[PDB]
Amino acid sequence: IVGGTASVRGEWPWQVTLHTTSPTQRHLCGGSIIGNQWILTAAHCFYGVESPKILRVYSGILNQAEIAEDTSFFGVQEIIIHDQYKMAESGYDIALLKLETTVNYADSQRPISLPSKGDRNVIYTDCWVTGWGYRKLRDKIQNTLQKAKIPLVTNEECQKRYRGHKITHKMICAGYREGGKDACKGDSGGPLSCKHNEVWHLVGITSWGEGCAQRERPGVYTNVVEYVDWILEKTQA
């Protein structure tokens, strides 16, 4: 997260840190709890991952320092990537992680509500982007969860900032015309929380961008609402 600040513990209870144990344990991507056994994240976050066995999901985390060999975690039973996904920049950058065990909700860890179709016209009040990603180009996973308030930009506006790319309606961007605040490497898979009527909503999933926080280069996120049907179909046994 660029241009952000340290989050308060439990402030973003749906945020999880997805780790990989190979070769050695490290943070890989961010993710969002959306069900007792389901994490919503980015598909491009599993590039080079042949097995869910090397994945570990940690919930209720503020500082990576909290994560040690004796720290409890959720094992991943299955990785579900959207069948139309090819690459972040082309869209469909969405994936479901089915945990091996259920999450016991608490103030430190709870699910975020998915947006409803009857909310695409809703002017999201305030949207916050969060993660342990890079604070700048060529940095390193940050210890304390960072947060940053970032306004959404129209698709038409985003397209202007990404000639050469096709910003579809299944994407949504956010950022300042002047840059300064944005997601960055490591925040991928993270949630783009928006406060709809004192109620949080998982509006987007951190996906991609040209550099980080550069001027006239908004962050691009998966437009979650365009996948509520997909999510329902994939989560029903």
What does this structure look like?
6% of the residues lie in helices and 32% in strands. It contains 2 helices and 14 strands. The chain has helices at residues 155-161, 228-235, and strands spanning 5-6, 15-20, 26-35, 38-41, 55-59, 74-81, 95-99, 127-131, 146-149, 152-153, 171-174, 191-196, 199-208, 219-223. The strands form 2 sheets. Strands 1-9-8-12-13-14-11-10 form an 8-stranded antiparallel sheet. The relative contact order is 0.23.
Helices and strands in order:
Elements: E1 5-6, E2 15-20, E3 26-35, E4 38-41, E5 55-59, E6 74-81, E7 95-99, E8 127-131, E9 146-149, E10 152-153, H1 155-161, E11 171-174, E12 191-196, E13 199-208, E14 219-223, H2 228-235
Antiparallel strand pairs: 1-9, 2-3, 2-5, 3-4, 4-7, 5-6, 6-7, 8-9, 8-12, 10-11, 11-14, 12-13, 13-14
Glycosylation sites: 63, 104
Protein name: Coagulation factor XIa light chain
Domain Peptidase S1: 1-236
